[PDB]
Amino acid sequence: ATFEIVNRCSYTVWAAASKGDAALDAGGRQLNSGESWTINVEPGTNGGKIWARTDCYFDDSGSGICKTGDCGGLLRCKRFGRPPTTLAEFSLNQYGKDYIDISNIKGFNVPMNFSPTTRGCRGVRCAADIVGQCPAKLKAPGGGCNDACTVFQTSEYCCTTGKCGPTEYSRFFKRLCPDAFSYVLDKPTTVTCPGSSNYRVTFCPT
């Protein structure tokens, strides 16, 4: 499957793509404002994620640091990124269908649209100014808006037992972005797409 990753932000981002135990395609790349990078994701990829990283520095070997979404200091991510990270999440060719969503469960750094480029389903978007409106206690000094699990490490926020409810913090993310997951047990906003659809992830869509 192809994923065109487009940076419409006025700032550079370093796109990242991983399924947690491996890179997807090269795993990461710099995207200056306006640039597009198309990756190939293997059919059947389960639990893939794409995200933006901000304020990165990498040496000539591709090792360094980012302020949001850092994946073990690598340009080419093999693992998931450090919160806060707005997440485009997908599982492809699962019993004939693809499943996509956006999640704020690991916080929010950059606004995102995640849409099919092929027929048969809708896209999802979280493009509100979550960083600007972020509750004071969730603001990450390194940049972005942390989720409450990251900040407070409670069973309730982290849904450790599989028994959590919505919270004042989750409701903030949900108010700003109704069509993204705000906590683990949120009413799903996953979209079913035809199996083997292709996609575009746009940072700063609006």
mmCIF file with all atom_site columns, N, CA and C in Angstrom, residues 123-148:
data_model
loop_
_atom_site.group_PDB
_atom_site.id
_atom_site.type_symbol
_atom_site.label_atom_id
_atom_site.label_alt_id
_atom_site.label_comp_id
_atom_site.label_asym_id
_atom_site.label_entity_id
_atom_site.label_seq_id
_atom_site.pdbx_PDB_ins_code
_atom_site.Cartn_x
_atom_site.Cartn_y
_atom_site.Cartn_z
_atom_site.occupancy
_atom_site.B_iso_or_equiv
_atom_site.pdbx_formal_charge
_atom_site.auth_seq_id
_atom_site.auth_comp_id
_atom_site.auth_asym_id
_atom_site.auth_atom_id
_atom_site.pdbx_PDB_model_num
ATOM 1  N N  . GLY A 1 123 ? -12.099 9.836  5.151  1.00 0.00 ? 123 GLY A N  1
ATOM 2  C CA . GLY A 1 123 ? -10.961 10.115 6.000  1.00 0.00 ? 123 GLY A CA 1
ATOM 3  C C  . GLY A 1 123 ? -11.351 10.565 7.403  1.00 0.00 ? 123 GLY A C  1
ATOM 4  N N  . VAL A 1 124 ? -10.320 10.708 8.222  1.00 0.00 ? 124 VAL A N  1
ATOM 5  C CA . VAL A 1 124 ? -10.470 11.225 9.577  1.00 0.00 ? 124 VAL A CA 1
ATOM 6  C C  . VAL A 1 124 ? -9.490  12.381 9.754  1.00 0.00 ? 124 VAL A C  1
ATOM 7  N N  . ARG A 1 125 ? -9.818  13.304 10.661 1.00 0.00 ? 125 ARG A N  1
ATOM 8  C CA . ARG A 1 125 ? -9.025  14.498 10.838 1.00 0.00 ? 125 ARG A CA 1
ATOM 9  C C  . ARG A 1 125 ? -9.029  14.950 12.290 1.00 0.00 ? 125 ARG A C  1
ATOM 10 N N  . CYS A 1 126 ? -7.869  15.424 12.740 1.00 0.00 ? 126 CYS A N  1
ATOM 11 C CA . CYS A 1 126 ? -7.732  16.127 14.011 1.00 0.00 ? 126 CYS A CA 1
ATOM 12 C C  . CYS A 1 126 ? -6.859  17.322 13.743 1.00 0.00 ? 126 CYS A C  1
ATOM 13 N N  . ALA A 1 127 ? -7.507  18.453 13.463 1.00 0.00 ? 127 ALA A N  1
ATOM 14 C CA . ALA A 1 127 ? -6.796  19.636 13.010 1.00 0.00 ? 127 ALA A CA 1
ATOM 15 C C  . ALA A 1 127 ? -6.972  20.856 13.846 1.00 0.00 ? 127 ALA A C  1
ATOM 16 N N  . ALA A 1 128 ? -7.652  20.730 14.975 1.00 0.00 ? 128 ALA A N  1
ATOM 17 C CA . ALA A 1 128 ? -7.840  21.831 15.894 1.00 0.00 ? 128 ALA A CA 1
ATOM 18 C C  . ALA A 1 128 ? -6.534  22.208 16.573 1.00 0.00 ? 128 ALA A C  1
ATOM 19 N N  . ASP A 1 129 ? -6.512  23.395 17.181 1.00 0.00 ? 129 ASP A N  1
ATOM 20 C CA . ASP A 1 129 ? -5.306  23.902 17.835 1.00 0.00 ? 129 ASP A CA 1
ATOM 21 C C  . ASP A 1 129 ? -5.176  23.338 19.258 1.00 0.00 ? 129 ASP A C  1
ATOM 22 N N  . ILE A 1 130 ? -4.938  22.033 19.324 1.00 0.00 ? 130 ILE A N  1
ATOM 23 C CA . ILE A 1 130 ? -4.829  21.375 20.610 1.00 0.00 ? 130 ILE A CA 1
ATOM 24 C C  . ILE A 1 130 ? -3.631  21.885 21.399 1.00 0.00 ? 130 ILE A C  1
ATOM 25 N N  . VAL A 1 131 ? -2.493  22.164 20.748 1.00 0.00 ? 131 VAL A N  1
ATOM 26 C CA . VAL A 1 131 ? -1.369  22.666 21.522 1.00 0.00 ? 131 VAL A CA 1
ATOM 27 C C  . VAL A 1 131 ? -1.695  24.036 22.118 1.00 0.00 ? 131 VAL A C  1
ATOM 28 N N  . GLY A 1 132 ? -2.275  24.932 21.324 1.00 0.00 ? 132 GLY A N  1
ATOM 29 C CA . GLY A 1 132 ? -2.581  26.260 21.851 1.00 0.00 ? 132 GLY A CA 1
ATOM 30 C C  . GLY A 1 132 ? -3.594  26.229 22.992 1.00 0.00 ? 132 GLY A C  1
ATOM 31 N N  . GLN A 1 133 ? -4.553  25.309 22.911 1.00 0.00 ? 133 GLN A N  1
ATOM 32 C CA . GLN A 1 133 ? -5.638  25.249 23.894 1.00 0.00 ? 133 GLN A CA 1
ATOM 33 C C  . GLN A 1 133 ? -5.365  24.266 25.038 1.00 0.00 ? 133 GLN A C  1
ATOM 34 N N  . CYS A 1 134 ? -4.224  23.588 25.004 1.00 0.00 ? 134 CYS A N  1
ATOM 35 C CA . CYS A 1 134 ? -3.900  22.517 25.930 1.00 0.00 ? 134 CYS A CA 1
ATOM 36 C C  . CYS A 1 134 ? -4.082  22.959 27.384 1.00 0.00 ? 134 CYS A C  1
ATOM 37 N N  . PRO A 1 135 ? -4.718  22.119 28.216 1.00 0.00 ? 135 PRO A N  1
ATOM 38 C CA . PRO A 1 135 ? -4.754  22.385 29.652 1.00 0.00 ? 135 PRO A CA 1
ATOM 39 C C  . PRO A 1 135 ? -3.356  22.581 30.211 1.00 0.00 ? 135 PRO A C  1
ATOM 40 N N  . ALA A 1 136 ? -3.207  23.523 31.135 1.00 0.00 ? 136 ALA A N  1
ATOM 41 C CA . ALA A 1 136 ? -1.900  23.824 31.688 1.00 0.00 ? 136 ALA A CA 1
ATOM 42 C C  . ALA A 1 136 ? -1.167  22.573 32.186 1.00 0.00 ? 136 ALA A C  1
ATOM 43 N N  . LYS A 1 137 ? -1.855  21.681 32.898 1.00 0.00 ? 137 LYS A N  1
ATOM 44 C CA . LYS A 1 137 ? -1.176  20.527 33.470 1.00 0.00 ? 137 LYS A CA 1
ATOM 45 C C  . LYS A 1 137 ? -0.708  19.511 32.437 1.00 0.00 ? 137 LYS A C  1
ATOM 46 N N  . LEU A 1 138 ? -1.245  19.594 31.221 1.00 0.00 ? 138 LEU A N  1
ATOM 47 C CA . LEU A 1 138 ? -0.865  18.662 30.156 1.00 0.00 ? 138 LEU A CA 1
ATOM 48 C C  . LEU A 1 138 ? 0.200   19.255 29.216 1.00 0.00 ? 138 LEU A C  1
ATOM 49 N N  . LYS A 1 139 ? 0.502   20.542 29.322 1.00 0.00 ? 139 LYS A N  1
ATOM 50 C CA . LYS A 1 139 ? 1.462   21.127 28.388 1.00 0.00 ? 139 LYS A CA 1
ATOM 51 C C  . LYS A 1 139 ? 2.807   20.438 28.560 1.00 0.00 ? 139 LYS A C  1
ATOM 52 N N  . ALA A 1 140 ? 3.429   20.004 27.473 1.00 0.00 ? 140 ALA A N  1
ATOM 53 C CA . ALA A 1 140 ? 4.748   19.364 27.596 1.00 0.00 ? 140 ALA A CA 1
ATOM 54 C C  . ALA A 1 140 ? 5.766   20.458 27.474 1.00 0.00 ? 140 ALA A C  1
ATOM 55 N N  . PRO A 1 141 ? 6.675   20.672 28.461 1.00 0.00 ? 141 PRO A N  1
ATOM 56 C CA . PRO A 1 141 ? 7.663   21.725 28.290 1.00 0.00 ? 141 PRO A CA 1
ATOM 57 C C  . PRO A 1 141 ? 8.549   21.553 27.070 1.00 0.00 ? 141 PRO A C  1
ATOM 58 N N  . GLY A 1 142 ? 8.726   20.322 26.611 1.00 0.00 ? 142 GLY A N  1
ATOM 59 C CA . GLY A 1 142 ? 9.491   20.054 25.404 1.00 0.00 ? 142 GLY A CA 1
ATOM 60 C C  . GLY A 1 142 ? 8.734   20.304 24.112 1.00 0.00 ? 142 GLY A C  1
ATOM 61 N N  . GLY A 1 143 ? 7.443   20.630 24.228 1.00 0.00 ? 143 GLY A N  1
ATOM 62 C CA . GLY A 1 143 ? 6.568   20.936 23.089 1.00 0.00 ? 143 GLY A CA 1
ATOM 63 C C  . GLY A 1 143 ? 5.402   19.959 23.018 1.00 0.00 ? 143 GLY A C  1
ATOM 64 N N  . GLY A 1 144 ? 4.210   20.458 22.620 1.00 0.00 ? 144 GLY A N  1
ATOM 65 C CA . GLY A 1 144 ? 3.019   19.610 22.440 1.00 0.00 ? 144 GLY A CA 1
ATOM 66 C C  . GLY A 1 144 ? 2.115   19.543 23.657 1.00 0.00 ? 144 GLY A C  1
ATOM 67 N N  . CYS A 1 145 ? 1.093   18.691 23.560 1.00 0.00 ? 145 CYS A N  1
ATOM 68 C CA . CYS A 1 145 ? 0.078   18.539 24.612 1.00 0.00 ? 145 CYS A CA 1
ATOM 69 C C  . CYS A 1 145 ? 0.051   17.059 24.992 1.00 0.00 ? 145 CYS A C  1
ATOM 70 N N  . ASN A 1 146 ? 0.555   16.756 26.185 1.00 0.00 ? 146 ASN A N  1
ATOM 71 C CA . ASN A 1 146 ? 0.612   15.377 26.642 1.00 0.00 ? 146 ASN A CA 1
ATOM 72 C C  . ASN A 1 146 ? -0.777  14.827 26.933 1.00 0.00 ? 146 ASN A C  1
ATOM 73 N N  . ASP A 1 147 ? -0.917  13.517 26.742 1.00 0.00 ? 147 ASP A N  1
ATOM 74 C CA . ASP A 1 147 ? -2.059  12.811 27.313 1.00 0.00 ? 147 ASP A CA 1
ATOM 75 C C  . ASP A 1 147 ? -1.878  12.670 28.840 1.00 0.00 ? 147 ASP A C  1
ATOM 76 N N  . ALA A 1 148 ? -3.009  12.434 29.514 1.00 0.00 ? 148 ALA A N  1
ATOM 77 C CA . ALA A 1 148 ? -2.989  12.358 30.972 1.00 0.00 ? 148 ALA A CA 1
ATOM 78 C C  . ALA A 1 148 ? -2.285  11.115 31.500 1.00 0.00 ? 148 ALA A C  1
#
